[PDB]
Design a protein around this ligand. Structure first.
Ligand SMILES: CCCCCCCCCCCCCCCCCC(=O)OC[C@H](COP(=O)([O-])OCC(O)COP(=O)([O-])OC[C@@H](COC(=O)CCCCCCCCCCCCCCCCC)OC(=O)CCCCCCCCCCCCCCCCC)OC(=O)CCCCCCCCCCCCCCCCC
Ligand SMILES: CCCCCCCCCCCCCCCCCC(=O)OC[C@H](COP(=O)([O-])OCC(O)COP(=O)([O-])OC[C@@H](COC(=O)CCCCCCCCCCCCCCCCC)OC(=O)CCCCCCCCCCCCCCCCC)OC(=O)CCCCCCCCCCCCCCCCC
Ligand SMILES: CCCCCCCCCCCCCCCCCC(=O)OC[C@H](COP(=O)([O-])OCC(O)COP(=O)([O-])OC[C@@H](COC(=O)CCCCCCCCCCCCCCCCC)OC(=O)CCCCCCCCCCCCCCCCC)OC(=O)CCCCCCCCCCCCCCCCC
Ligand SMILES: CCCCCCCCCCCCCCCCCC(=O)OC[C@H](COP(=O)([O-])OCC[N+](C)(C)C)OC(=O)CCCCCCCCCCCCCCCCC
Ligand SMILES: CCCCCCCCCCCCCCCCCC(=O)OC[C@H](COP(=O)([O-])OCC[N+](C)(C)C)OC(=O)CCCCCCCCCCCCCCCCC
Ligand SMILES: CCCCCCCCCCCCCCCCCC(=O)OC[C@H](COP(=O)(O)OCCN)OC(=O)CCCCCCCCCCCCCCCCC
Ligand SMILES: CCCCCCCCCCCCCCCCCC(=O)OC[C@H](COP(=O)(O)OCCN)OC(=O)CCCCCCCCCCCCCCCCC
Ligand SMILES: CCCCCCCCCCCCCCCCCC(=O)OC[C@H](COP(=O)(O)OCCN)OC(=O)CCCCCCCCCCCCCCCCC
Ligand SMILES: CCCCCCCCCCCCCCCCCC(=O)OC[C@H](COP(=O)(O)OCCN)OC(=O)CCCCCCCCCCCCCCCCC
Ligand SMILES: Nc1ncnc2c1ncn2[C@@H]1O[C@H](COP(=O)(O)OP(=O)(O)O)[C@@H](O)[C@H]1O
Lengths: 67, 175, 89, 132, 30, 168, 115, 231, 149, 102, 109
């Protein structure tokens, strides 16, 4: 209910099962990932831009991030 | 996120793929995951969770199916003990039945044992045998309802498929 | 059981390959004092002309090789079939 | 799954089981534990592109699943260890049929991604058996 | 009653200074 | 939640033994029950703390997607076996069970032997099945068989029917 | 040690039944409580209060060989299990191993997804 | 503040970094032009030989004797009660002798110093010759310490107090493996540090690290289970 | 979120409106409002006194009477003279605390921590990436306590 | 359920009832305490809900600030000689050179 | 603590004070120039006079904090947008009003 409407996991599990983890990761996982992917997203954008030019960059090929 | 436990062993780790050298005592969680925790814990690690759940269920059914083989051979031996007098029972039993009895023995079937100790290859062979049986019974739609749950439309479509298959097989030249 | 499971790794030993060169390369950093002594011996021997035959750098080389192979020999042996430590001891 | 049709059979669909090599099992398991991000990405991308351009009146309806083509190609490169091309269209002919089946089961008959993983791993296994 | 072990003589045995003798037994353990 | 629900069975049990038991010796029996079962609970707590801290999750499927090293798995199996055997009870950790059964009220003695030890068994089964363990279980098998033998050999020397049932 | 065949006077100081304060008595079958025999009660509360007198008395009390065998019984059981493990390993039978062949799936546990 | 620094050393990492190595030869090499006194005084390098087993045993005994003397000084001598007549005789000796306090300390500390020396030497020999080739280092340490301390308490304190000695030996072995044998609170290299070989291109290394990061994203429970909302 | 206009008699209520639960700002963090005097002296703060600080003093005087009575409710064995003296001392203490609060408000207005009738030329652009409070406050009383939601 | 105000009101009601039972005084004693406790508990728990949400948000922002601190501490915690090592040279020069624009 | 840039900036010489008004005037001018340039990397040499004024007016710790905050702001602006963040937070709260059922029998890893 009102106490446990802040996270889709029960309060006991939140209190004990998350030891030494960032509350950003626990509560806003998508923002945490997209923030840690800041440079990788720019590299992927550059890779796409060069691919549209016919220049396939092999180095940044694995960087295909969906979330 | 998966973590890890700090390691105490002072042993070098050499990775040819990444051309890096690491010490076991100094590894982060990801390095431990990719180096120390990279081993396998099931017969078929190349399968997904759903695929390996199906594999495990088929393996259990295969163990029970080999036990069913042994039980059926025992029941046929009991039948021979009644329909055939002792004056000629052992000859007819040594014809074919005794060989199958020794085939379905302690190592080849789990029986009453706690664990049927199979390698991953043996488990895969048992599961493939179960899948062959499933294929040959499903091609005729025998799974419904004992071994399958199908809706009414699925049952009707399967009946039509089996009817066409039966006609095609009946109208084939004999070998 | 673990023995009934597939193996997740394939080392050079398990592939029938010799890791001796790589292990030598990765054990050379363990022994740099001896390598520097050997280099100094070679430099001094090249410095003078027609030195006494009882003046060789084979002994510094022996020290360096002993130090290096003290690192490469056991490790590879630990990866060989039939080198298991035993059931109890 | 791990069944081969019997070429000379008394009936239509008799099959015989086989077990892949330990090398193939190890390779497929390791790559799936290393490239499982791309598969989940393909599933989520398929769902999101159906959400956005699924309606026929949308501007992006004619583009189909092309935004997930990059994810499919990345998954192919990761599973093939960057040795059999940069795109799944460059697949060897042995894995061509399995690739076609995967594409059908992933983007035409939108089955649950378990079957799609089965077909993609079939492509990978065909490639491995060809070039072990 | 003490031996240097850096002169190529293991435990005072001074006959084998011209070869590598220690690896596997004294220097390392095969 | 599994571990917590396993841990919630102590307070009502101790309250029943402490206040409902008619025998005057049942206070010490309640203390023994609490201390023994709580030592077992501490061992299980250490094991579950290892599990949670190493793999930051709370789901058995997430455990399936993770592998513990040999040392970690050995520590986990030893801890869970020893804790759930404190609650089982196992040799030599059945002194609390003997004292409590002799001194607890008959209703709780029915409930203590009948059920709670089965909760310990269920906890051990859930914990050990979800984790790959590569050590030989001969030590645990020997402990269990020694418990069986030790309990069976003491049945002749019991003139108390309730203590005899406790040994059974 | 053994019981004394000689006739002895009834005990004057022996452990007896004691009940918790404010105890509700058991009133089954008319609430008829008979006086208890002192020897019977003494035997009832004798083993529970028996203690060893000196350090190491537990060894030589009774049969030293039997006590040693009982003490070494868990070790004997473990060693016999090790011998049986050797036999199973030589014959590839069921070993004393935690067979993780289900990969973590429990016994007939429901595994369904929520929409 | 470190424990067992020389044994707990990543020699490969130290050599790669160029850091000084405690395993480097610590010895003196006189030339054939030095004085005889220079030749003799250069023989002190034998005291620096950690492979000299006699020297190692003597120094372990010295450390044990120092620990025993410290225990006698701080916790041992003051705990026990000397008879009054004996104390009076000792103080009379101190009165009539120029350095009687040194003799008193020699007499009082001699049993403790000898016990410490014997325990240290026997412990070093036991660990070095019996348990240095065992595979399970933690188990070997625990068992060796348990047996050694059970025997020691059975002969130094009281034979009846041997279970407690065994338990204390188990605890001491666990502590020794945790800190004296493992680099806890004494790390000499950063966690996750590595060294590179093979002369791989920087582009290739970047590609490999991108592949590792893609695999690393599977360690997140939300990513792996597909439980992320569209951001 | 709106704040009570400064230099009025309710300007001290802006002390209870905080955009973040932080006690203080960082070293290089710009204050919410333009700085009038960063190197403020005691007489500078006194000169910057206004109706907001006077209203804070008046609020202390108004609420200080029941608080002083509540303190006196625990007094026993006391004559009327001592009771009146204790009440006077407690009330003067509360009024002095109100004076301190007004001084703090003037200092904050000098430093730009609270509203001072001035606005920065370009506001700091913040993305409310983590937001557990907007929907809660827009449907509750607490929209009046958090500035800028 | 959904309203922290109603949850606090129920909490105050039950707290008053349990305090009456614990004190052994009859219920329906000091009846004005029930609405007073309801109001006080409702306000207190409403404020605590708001404060915990605010604390979680500012904690997320503080963690964003702290990730920089942990990175720069890891670079400053490198053992001597590891700064120029191949595993940390790039990051060390990024923070020492590129991130030096004051 | 020794690794904390904030805690090191909070340290100061005895008698050292910061004219925050002048510091923030210079910072606002320099950052307005930089944002007018609007480059991925803050090239302070492209706003020379304002860069000199910012260096003279502000202290080293203040400038370090300002540059760290500017880097964080640039990253956030390149990553997110207001309406996207609003929708994401609304969806996150709505999901938090529910439960996270386990993904039994997955298809990956
Ligand atoms: C500077 C240091 C501080 C000096 C002032 C201290 C004042 C008191 C401080 C408070 C604590 C008091 C404790 C109890 C007590 O002493 O009661 C008083 C005690 C009782 O009073 P009393 O009843 O009047 O006694 C009547 C008589 O006076 C009874 O007299 P006595 O003849 O019975 O006693 C002689 C006295 C005094 O003895 C000496 O002075 C001995 C001098 C020679 C020492 C040995 C050679 C040193 C060589 C130095 C150079 C080395 C170079 C490097 C070499 C390589 C090293 C690896 O020695 C002792 O009492 C025994 C102490 C230990 C002796 C040395 C042991 C060395 C072990 C190895 C190191 O009175 C006295 O002892 C009289 C003197 C006052 C106390 C002095 C205590 C000194 C203890 C430290 C050792 C000093 C020498 C060695 C220095 C180097 C060490 C590394
Ligand atoms: C005694 C009463 C027991 C029951 C008590 C009541 C029940 C509740 C309490 C808990 C009971 C279980 C205690 C388990 C302790 C931890 C064991 C463990 O995790 O081992 C890991 C280890 C798996 O790691 P691994 O890599 O395979 O290690 C194999 C090699 O050690 C790797 O290669 P390696 O080079 O290490 O191989 C050499 C190693 C191979 O190992 C052996 O041969 C057996 C080692 C244990 C010997 C115990 C002898 C006791 C009687 C004397 O042998 C030795 O190191 C020397 C063996 C002779 C030792 C003589 C000194 C004994 C001192 C007194 C006892 C101290 C106990 C300390 C307990 C510490 C607990 C934290 O698992 C086992 O050793 C299996 C567990 C059973 C061991 C033998 C138990 C015999 C008694 C059974 C009683 C049944 C009731
Ligand atoms: C989730 C976990 C975290 C916890 C989250 C919630 C926070 C805790 C809430 C607990 C209580 C909620 C229900 C209240 C029931 C009720 O209506 O009580 C009325 C009841 C009044 O009884 P009464 O018989 O009607 O009064 C007549 C008497 O003659 C006495 O009358 P009097 O003439 O002597 O004085 C009258 C005065 C009597 O009340 C007082 O004197 C209150 C003193 C409370 C203790 C000191 C706290 C406050 C410190 C000073 C604050 C100053 C603010 C600025 C003031 C400026 C002007 C001076 O005022 C009133 O009676 C009217 C109500 C005033 C407000 C009451 C609430 C005060 C704040 C409570 C929370 C404190 C902070 C917690 C952390 C917050 C973090 C953001 O109040 C009390 O019993 C005291 C206040 C409420 C309880 C405070 C102690 C809490 C204990 C639980 C601790 C929980 C720990 C959690 C962590 C560990 C587990 C996870
Ligand atoms: C329980 C077992 C406890 C230990 C048992 C006895 C071990 C030593 C046996 C005697 C030989 C010996 O000590 O050899 C090692 C060494 C041999 O002398 P060393 O110093 O020349 O050793 C050279 C290296 N090895 C051992 C390979 C030959 O002697 C000692 O350590 C001296 C011990 C007594 C010191 C006083
Ligand atoms: C406006 C108020 C509306 C609700 C009023 C309800 C009054 C009756 C409550 C039920 C009742 O009679 O209970 C008797 C009992 C009497 O308690 P008691 O402890 O005195 O009774 C014990 C004595 N015997 C055994 C003889 C009965 O009262 C209660 O259980 C609680 C009474 C208070 C209830 C408060 C409800 C909320 C009020 C909110 C006001 C704002
Ligand atoms: C009391 C609270 C629990 C304390 C537990 C302390 C355990 C310390 C273990 C230290 C250690 O490093 O042990 C390693 C040792 C052997 O592990 P090994 O198989 O060599 O590992 C290689 C792959 N990981 O590991 C072992 O031999 C297993 C040790 C188990 C100890 C008993 C577990 C608790 C029993 C109560
Ligand atoms: C909290 C504390 C945290 C402590 C962390 C570390 C714990 C473990 C420390 C172990 C130190 C040790 O014993 O090291 C062994 C040492 C020899 O070291 P090394 O030469 O490197 O060993 C070669 C390998 N075998 O050998 C030695 O040091 C030898 C001495 C060890 C044994 C000492 C025994 C006690 C001595 C005093 C006895 C006094 C008795 C008094 C009572 C009786 C009186 C009659
Ligand atoms: C503190 C808690 C300690 C708990 C110890 C539990 C295990 C007990 C044990 O293994 O005892 C070893 C046994 C004891 O022998 P015993 O002489 O009878 O002990 C009484 C001493 N006054 O002694 C032996 O079995 C001797 C051989 C070593 C084992
Ligand atoms: C639709 C609605 C319509 C209207 C409905 C009816 C009206 C609703 C009214 C709602 C409430 C109005 C509240 C008015 C203002 C109240 C002010 C207040 O209580 O502040 C509490 C205080 C504020 O926190 P904060 O601002 O972050 O701290 C200073 C930071 N510069 O916070 C603190 O002081 C926090 C202290 C933190 C450290 C201590 C607490 C944590 C550790 C202890 C935990 C608890 C243990 C017990 C402690 C003692 C409890 C007595
Ligand atoms: N509890 C006991 N302990 C030891 N010996 C006993 C016990 N009860 C009976 N006996 C032995 O059995 C015999 C039976 O004696 P009993 O018939 O009880 O006494 P009596 O012959 O005087 O009636 C006794 O002589 C005694 O030696």
């Amino acid at each position: 209910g009102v106490w446990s409407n802040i996270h889709p996991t029960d309060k006991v599990t939140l209190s004990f099962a998350n030891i030494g983890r960032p509350f950003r990761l626990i509560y806003r996982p998508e923002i945490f990932l997209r923030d840690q992917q800041a440079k990788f997203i720019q590299l992927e954008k550059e890779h796409i831009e060069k691919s549209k030019k016919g220049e396939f960059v092999e180095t940044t090929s694995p960087l295909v991030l969906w979330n | 996120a998966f973590g890890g436990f700090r390691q105490t062993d002072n042993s070098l780790i050499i990775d040819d793929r990444r051309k890096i050298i690491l010490n076991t005592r100094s590894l982060n969680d990801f390095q431990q995951k990719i180096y120390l925790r990279n081993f396998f814990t099931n017969y078929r690690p190349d399968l997904s969770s759903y695929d390996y759940f199906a594999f495990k269920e088929k393996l259990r059914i295969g163990e029970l199916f080999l036990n069913e083989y042994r039980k059926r051979i025992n029941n046929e031996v009991r039948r021979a003990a009644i329909l055939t007098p002792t004056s000629s029972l052992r000859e007819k039993m040594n014809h074919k039945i005794a060989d199958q009895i020794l085939d379905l023995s302690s190592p080849h079937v789990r029986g009453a044992h706690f664990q049927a100790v199979r390698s991953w290859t043996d488990a895969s062979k048992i599961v493939n045998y179960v899948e062959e049986k499933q294929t040959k019974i499903n091609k005729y739609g025998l799974q419904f309802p004992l071994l399958g749950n199908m809706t009414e439309e699925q049952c009707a479509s399967k009946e039509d498929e089996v009817y066409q298959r039966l006609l095609k097989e009946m109208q084939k030249p004999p070998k | 059981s673990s023995g009934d499971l597939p193996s997740a790794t394939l080392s050079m030993i398990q592939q029938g390959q010799d890791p001796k060169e790589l292990v030598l390369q990765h054990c050379k950093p363990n022994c740099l004092h001896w390598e520097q002594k050997l280099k100094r011996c070679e430099a001094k021997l090249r410095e003078l002309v027609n030195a006494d035959p009882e003046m060789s750098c084979m002994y510094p080389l022996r020290d360096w090789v002993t130090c290096v192979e003290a690192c490469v020999q056991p490790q590879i042996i630990s990866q060989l079939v039939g080198a298991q430590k035993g059931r109890i001891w | 799954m791990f069944l081969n049709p019997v070429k000379d059979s008394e009936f239509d669909d008799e099959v015989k089981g086989f077990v892949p090599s330990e090398g193939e099992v190890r390779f497929v398991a390791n790559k799936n534990k290393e490239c499982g991000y791309y598969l989940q990405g393909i599933e989520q991308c398929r769902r999101k592109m159906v959400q956005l351009a699924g309606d026929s009146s949308s501007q992006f309806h004619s583009l189909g699943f092309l935004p997930c083509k990059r994810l499919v190609d990345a998954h192919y490169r990761c599973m093939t260890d960057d040795k059999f091309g940069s795109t799944i269209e460059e697949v060897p002919e042995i894995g061509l049929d399995s690739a076609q089946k995967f594409f059908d089961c992933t983007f035409q008959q939108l089955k649950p991604m378990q079957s799609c993983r089965r077909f993609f791993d079939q492509v990978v296994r065909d490639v491995y058996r060809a070039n072990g | 009653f003490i031996y240097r072990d850096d002169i190529g003589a293991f435990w005072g045995i001074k006959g084998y200074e011209e070869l590598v003798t220690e690896v596997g037994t004294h220097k390392g353990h095969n | 939640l599994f571990f917590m629900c396993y841990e919630l069975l102590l307070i009502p049990s101790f309250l029943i033994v402490y206040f409902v038991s008619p025998s005057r010796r049942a206070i010490q029996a309640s203390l023994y029950f609490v201390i023994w079962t709580q030592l077992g609970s501490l061992l299980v707590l250490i094991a579950i703390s290892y599990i949670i801290s190493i793999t930051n999750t709370y789901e058995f499927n997430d455990l399936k997607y993770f592998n513990f090293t040999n040392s970690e798995s050995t520590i986990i199996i030893f801890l869970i076996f020893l804790g759930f055997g404190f609650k089982a009870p196992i040799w030599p950790f059945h002194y609390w069970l003997t004292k409590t059964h002799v001194e607890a009220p008959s209703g709780f003695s029915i409930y203590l032997s009948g059920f709670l030890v089965k909760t310990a068994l269920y906890g051990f089964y859930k914990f050990n099945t979800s984790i790959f363990i590569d050590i030989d279980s001969s030590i645990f098998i020997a402990i269990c068989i020694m418990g069986v033998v030790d309990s069976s050999l003491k049945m002749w020397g019991q003139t108390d029917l309730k203590k005899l049932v406790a040994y059974g | 040690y053994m019981g004394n065949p000689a006739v002895q006077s009834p005990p004057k100081e022996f452990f007896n039944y004691h009940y918790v304060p404010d105890n509700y008595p058991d009133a089954l079958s008319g609430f008829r409580i008979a006086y208890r025999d002192p020897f019977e009660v003494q035997h009832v509360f004798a083993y529970e209060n028996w203690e060893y007198q000196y350090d190491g008395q537990w060894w030589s009390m009774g049969s030293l060989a039997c006590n040693v065998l009982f003490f070494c019984t868990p070790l004997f059981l473990y060693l016999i299990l090790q011998v049986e493990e050797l036999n199973s390993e030589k014959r590839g039978g069921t070993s004393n191993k935690f067979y993780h062949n289900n990969a973590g799936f429990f016994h007939f546990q429901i595994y369904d997804n929520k929409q | 503040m470190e424990l067992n620094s020389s044994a707990k050393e990543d020699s490969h990492y130290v050599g790669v970094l160029g850091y000084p190595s405690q395993h480097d030869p610590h010895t003196l090499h006189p030339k054939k032009h030095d004085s005889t006194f220079t030749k003799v005084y250069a023989c002190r390098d034998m005291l620096w030989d950690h492979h000299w087993e006699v020297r190692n045993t003597l120094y372990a005994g010295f450390k044990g004797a120092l620990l025993g003397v410290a225990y006698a000084s701080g916790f041992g001598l003051i705990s026990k009660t000397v008879p009054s007549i004996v104390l009076k005789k000792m103080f009379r000796f101190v009165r009539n002798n120029n350095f009687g306090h040194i003799r008193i300390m020699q007499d009082l500390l001699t049993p403790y110093a000898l016990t410490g020396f014997g325990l240290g030497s026997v412990y070093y020999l036991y660990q070095h010759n019996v348990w240095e080739n065992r595979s399970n280092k933690w188990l070997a340490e625990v068992l060796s310490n348990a047996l050694f301390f059970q025997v020691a308490t059975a002969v130094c304190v009281n034979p009846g107090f041997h279970i407690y000695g065994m338990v204390g030996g188990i605890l001491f072995g666990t502590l020794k493996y945790a800190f004296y044998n493992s680099s806890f609170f004494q790390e000499k290299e950063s966690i996750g540090s590595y060294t590179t070989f093979g002369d791989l291109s920087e582009e290739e290394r970047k590609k490999q690290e991108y592949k590792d990061y893609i695999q690393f994203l599977g360690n997140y429970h939300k990513v792996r289970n597909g439980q992320l909302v569209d951001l | 979120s709106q704040t009570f206009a400064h230099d009025s008699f309710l300007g001290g209520l802006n002390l209870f409106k905080r955009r973040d639960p932080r006690f203080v700002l960082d070293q290089g963090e710009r204050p919410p409002y333009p700085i009038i005097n960063s190197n403020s002296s005691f007489v500078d703060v006194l000169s910057n006194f206004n109706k907001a600080d006077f209203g804070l003093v008046l609020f202390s005087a108004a609420i200080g009477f029941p608080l002083s009575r509540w303190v006196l409710k625990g007094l026993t064995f006391s004559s009327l003279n001592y009771r009146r003296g204790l009440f006077s001392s407690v009330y003067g203490g509360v009024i002095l605390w109100g004076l301190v609060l007004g001084f703090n408000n003037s200092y904050y207005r000098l430093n730009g921590f609270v509203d001072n009738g001035l606005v920065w030329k370009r506001k700091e652009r913040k993305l409310n990436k983590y937001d557990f409070t907007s929907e809660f406050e827009d449907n509750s009383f607490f929209k009046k306590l958090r500035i800028r939601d | 359920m959904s309203s922290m105000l109603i949850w606090g009101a129920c909490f105050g009601l039950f707290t008053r009832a349990a305090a009456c039972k614990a004190s052994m005084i009859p219920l329906t004693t000091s009846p004005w305490k029930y609405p007073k406790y309801m109001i006080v508990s409702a306000v207190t728990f409403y404020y605590f809900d708001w404060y915990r949400r605010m604390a979680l948000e500012q904690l997320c922002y503080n963690e964003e600030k702290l990730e920089r601190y942990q990175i720069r501490a890891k670079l400053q915690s490198l053992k001597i000689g590891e700064e120029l090592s191949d595993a940390y040279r790039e990051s060390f020069f990024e923070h020492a050179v590129q991130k030096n624009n004051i | 603590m020794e690794f904390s840039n904030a805690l090191l900036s909070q340290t100061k010489l005895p008698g050292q004070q910061y004219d925050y008004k002048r510091c923030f005037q210079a910072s606002n001018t320099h950052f307005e120039c930089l944002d007018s340039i609007r480059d991925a990397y803050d090239n302070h040499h492209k706003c020379p006079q304002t860069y000199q004024a910012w260096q003279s007016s502000c202290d080293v710790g203040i400038r370090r904090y300002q540059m760290d905050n500017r880097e964080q702001q640039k990253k956030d602006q390149l990553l997110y947008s207001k309406e996207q963040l609003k929708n994401y937070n609304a969806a996150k709260n709505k999901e938090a009003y529910g439960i996270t059922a386990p993904k039994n029998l997955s298809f990956a890893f």
